[PDB]
Amino acid sequence: GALKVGLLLPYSGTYAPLGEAITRGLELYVQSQGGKLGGRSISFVKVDDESAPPKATELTTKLIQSEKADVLIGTVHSGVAMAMVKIAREDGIPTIVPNAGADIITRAMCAPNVFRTSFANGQIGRATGDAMIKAGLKKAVTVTWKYAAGEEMVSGFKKSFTAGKGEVVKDITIAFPDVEFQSALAEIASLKPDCVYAFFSGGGALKFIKDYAAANLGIPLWGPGFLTDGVEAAAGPAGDGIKTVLHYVSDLDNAENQAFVKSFEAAYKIPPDVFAVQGWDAGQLLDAGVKAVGGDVAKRKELNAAMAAASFASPRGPFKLSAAHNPVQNFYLRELKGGKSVNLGLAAPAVADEAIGCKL
């Protein structure tokens, strides 16, 4: 029969476009392989997590127990993902996290069956802060949503910004997923920083970019690249000049990216963003696992071990995992210019997240 791949993703709410992009990346990859992974037909069982941590346990249990998924792929929101991984790590089902950056997933919750194709929150925050110090910035205000991902990406940023002798004069938070930003912008003006570090993503990021530009602050905006990915065209001139750090830029010139961008644009009529890349690579990682067991997914231990050792070309570059199963990959400095992010050069080379707490 078909291999049942459970997809726990946001198909509604604020992160619906990210769930859509990840699903597109994964489906496009399966199509690129003639509709199979490791010889097996694929059936996607798509469960909407609503980016709602209170539902995460029950939805994960539905996928593992009631739907009898063979593989679990999810999710976007770090709070949902940490609850999902808490169950999945005890069950043993092969599990791939295609976005959620929660630090714990490849730290204390690391497990032989849990893999990530995206990033860790603290690591990307650190890379962004270090790029800002290298740029000569000294006095930051941070603004983000009040949940794990925002807290962790701000924490990483603050560590590298303050190690570089910068000062963070205020951390402003907004309830998730509220998009009333004007009072935060007035506070930012009053604090007179030399930069702002922001984490938002999806339509909330678009609104933030628009509102920030309309405030006429004369202060440069920075963030992890989630702040701009997927919203570049709609942001228009308000986006121009925003600086970000991310593990993907659409202009990367390698063969895998060129073919992927062409295939994705032909299918969906927009460029792929980082979320689509992360879904595509979840497909490549699963393919590696299923091929190594000749399609026999009953061989879970062997399938998971093969994924741990996998390496393949990603649209990013060479893909490989650390011992804790997080990607080891470049982070690029980018600027939004002309309705797309362009590569300004390498911000961080490919180094393994410290993985403190990951035992075995």
Side-chain angles (χ1 to χ4, degrees):
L3 202 148
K4 301 182 74 164
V5 179
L7 300 191
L8 183 67
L9 290 169
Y11 291 110
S12 64
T14 199
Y15 286 156
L18 284 62
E20 176 183 68
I22 292 165
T23 301
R24 286 172 169 184
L26 179 56
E27 290 177 327
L28 195 69
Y29 182 71
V30 168
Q31 177 176 70
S32 80
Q33 305 299 302
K36 328 290 221 187
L37 299 176
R40 301 287 308 271
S41 309
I42 305 297
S43 167
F44 289 114
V45 182
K46 302 175 174 180
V47 174
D48 184 12
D49 77 357
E50 306 173 358
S51 302
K55 301 190 164 180
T57 293
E58 70 194 75
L59 297 176
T60 302
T61 298
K62 165 186 179 64
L63 272 177
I64 296 173
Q65 321 273 61
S66 312
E67 299 281 3
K68 305 176 297 200
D70 295 303
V71 175
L72 176 64
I73 302 177
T75 182
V76 171
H77 183 288
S78 279
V80 179
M82 67 180 70
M84 186 202 79
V85 168
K86 181 173 181 175
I87 296 165
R89 70 187 304 280
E90 293 292 2
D91 178 82
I93 184 168
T95 299
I96 308 167
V97 178
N99 185 70
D103 289 333
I104 198 166
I105 291 175
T106 59
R107 290 181 174 204
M109 280 193 194
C110 82
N113 64 312
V114 173
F115 301 89
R116 179 145 60 189
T117 62
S118 61
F119 63 91
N121 287 332
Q123 190 170 24
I124 193 171
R126 282 187 164 274
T128 307
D130 198 42
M132 292 163 73
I133 290 297
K134 184 179 181 184
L137 296 165
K138 305 196 313 174
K139 183 186 177 185
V141 170
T142 71
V143 59
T144 191
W145 279 314
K146 192 170 175 292
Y147 83 105
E151 295 156 5
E152 287 176 4
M153 286 191 243
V154 162
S155 180
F157 158 79
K158 288 172 67 180
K159 290 174 191 164
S160 66
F161 200 73
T162 66
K165 304 307 293 155
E167 298 198 340
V168 181
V169 300
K170 196 73 68 178
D171 302 299
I172 303 171
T173 65
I174 301 293
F176 178 80
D178 197 80
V179 300
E180 292 301 324
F181 299 125
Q182 287 187 13
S183 63
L185 297 170
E187 189 181 352
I188 284 163
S190 77
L191 290 161
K192 300 178 187 185
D194 66 9
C195 57
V196 172
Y197 174 85
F199 165 65
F200 295 102
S201 181
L206 175 59
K207 189 173 186 296
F208 184 82
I209 289 168
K210 289 190 164 183
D211 292 346
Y212 188 100
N216 295 318
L217 290 169
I219 298 162
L221 179 61
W222 283 74
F226 318 110
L227 180 62
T228 61
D229 261 48
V231 298
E232 307 96 334
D240 283 329
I242 295 173
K243 293 255 174 52
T244 64
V245 169
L246 199 65
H247 52 292
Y248 181 69
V249 202
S250 59
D251 64 10
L252 288 169
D253 69 281
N254 71 68
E256 181 76 6
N257 194 46
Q258 292 309 300
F260 172 68
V261 167
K262 181 170 171 191
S263 287
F264 193 100
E265 287 178 356
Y268 304 116
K269 313 310 191 313
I270 62 175
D273 63 14
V274 68
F275 309 110
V277 172
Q278 292 166 174
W280 175 267
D281 289 332
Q284 303 206 79
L285 185 61
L286 183 55
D287 203 13
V290 179
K291 285 160 86 180
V293 295
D296 182 3
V297 302
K299 288 177 171 130
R300 283 185 174 175
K301 188 170 319 261
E302 297 84 359
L303 189 159
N304 288 326
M307 292 203 298
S311 63
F312 49 79
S314 166
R316 289 176 272 186
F319 184 92
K320 73 191 165 181
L321 296 174
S322 69
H325 300 173
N326 201 54
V328 178
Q329 69 193 331
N330 287 338
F331 291 92
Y332 313 100
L333 178 67
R334 318 182 309 160
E335 182 177 348
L336 182 47
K337 203 64 185 108
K340 60 201 234 298
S341 282
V342 302
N343 191 358
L344 298 183
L346 193 58
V351 313
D353 176 76
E354 176 167 12
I356 166 70
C358 181
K359 296 194 171 53
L360 285 74

